[model samples]
Target: ADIEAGKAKYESTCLSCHGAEGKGQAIFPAVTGQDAAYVTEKLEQYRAGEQVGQHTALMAPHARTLSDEDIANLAAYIDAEFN
Candidate 1:
């Protein structure tokens, strides 16, 4: 369920900030072709009360809303962007 939700959520909520191609701006940082393991680890850590200076307060709330399963799909989607 979250896989599909991730797709919808990413497209609707993340695409604009991250871009459809994940070619991030200097402000946002890159996501395209990044390591999935690192992505999942950071997302989970942020969601579980870890503070990340790289992320904005606007993004923190959204990261906290994401499930582990959602993070997996997001990582898959982001990592696959260059392929």
Candidate 2:
């Protein structure tokens, strides 16, 4: 399932900052309990180099590597499990 894939992706790449449960650390904002559509929109903006916040630069590079499906899967997983 996409949720599983998203978990794997999050663990492998996102855990460093977002934490195991999407409960962000330090400068990394919490990504859990977010609306999937919101997450997707932010990811799209980050990928497009459109700044969304002070952390935009930090997130842009990471978002750039994500495919559309990856974004969908990650958003779905974070919304479903983290909340």
Question: Number of the top candidate by lDDT?
Answer: 2
* lDDT for 69 (candidate 1): 82
- Count: clashes, candidate 2: 0
Residue pairs in candidate 2 whose N, alpha carbon or C atoms collide under 3 angstroms = none
Q: How many clashing pairs does model 1 include?
A: 0
User: For residue 4, what is the lDDT in candidate 1?
Assistant: 58
What lDDT does model 1 reach? 0.71
- In the range 1-83, model 2's lDDT, one tens digit per residue, is 39999888888888899988788987689997788898888888888889789768777889888999999988888888788
Per-candidate RMSD vs. true structure?
2.6, 1.3
Question: RMSD in Å for candidate 1, one decimal?
Answer: 2.6
Q: Native-vs-model 2 lDDT?
A: 0.85
Per-model CA lDDT versus the true structure: 0.71, 0.85
Residue-wise lDDT of candidate 1 within 1-83, one digit each (tens)?
24455567679878787777777655685676677777788778778777777555756777888877889987766655533
TM-score of each: 0.76, 0.91
